[PDB]
Curated annotation (Swiss-Prot):
This is Protein bicaudal C homolog 1. It comes from the Eukaryota. It is found in: Cytoplasm. Interacts (via KH domains) with ANKS6 (via SAM domain) in an RNA-dependent manner. Interacts with ANKS3. Putative RNA-binding protein. Acts as a negative regulator of Wnt signaling. May be involved in regulating gene expression during embryonic development. It comes from Homo sapiens (Human). It is linked to Renal dysplasia, cystic: An anomaly of the kidney characterized by numerous renal cysts and apparent disorder of differentiation of the renal parenchyma. Kidney of affected individuals lack the normal renal bean shape, and the collection drainage system. The cystic, dysplastic kidney contains undifferentiated mesenchyme, cartilaginous tissue, and immature collecting ducts. The gene is BICC1. Belongs to the BicC family.
């Protein structure tokens, strides 16, 4: 029930190792913004859009 599972649901599975290698845990991921994601190196626009949408959803009750 963690970041690897989430990414698999979003079709972002190939990015799981990027975040793991950068020591990004689920809690930290859920605090990220678009600027942070670009700074993190997620250049692929679509991957970034899906991540932000997931972040958005998990911050809503
Ligand atoms: Zn947009």
């Amino acid at each position: 029930s963690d970041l690897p599972e989430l990414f698999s649901k979003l079709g972002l599975g190939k990015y799981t190792d990027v975040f793991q290698q950068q020591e990004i845990d689920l809690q930290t991921f859920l605090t990220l913004t678009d600027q942070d994601l670009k700074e993190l190196g997620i250049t692929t626009f679509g991957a970034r859009e899906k991540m932000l949408l997931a972040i958005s959803e998990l911050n809503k009750n």
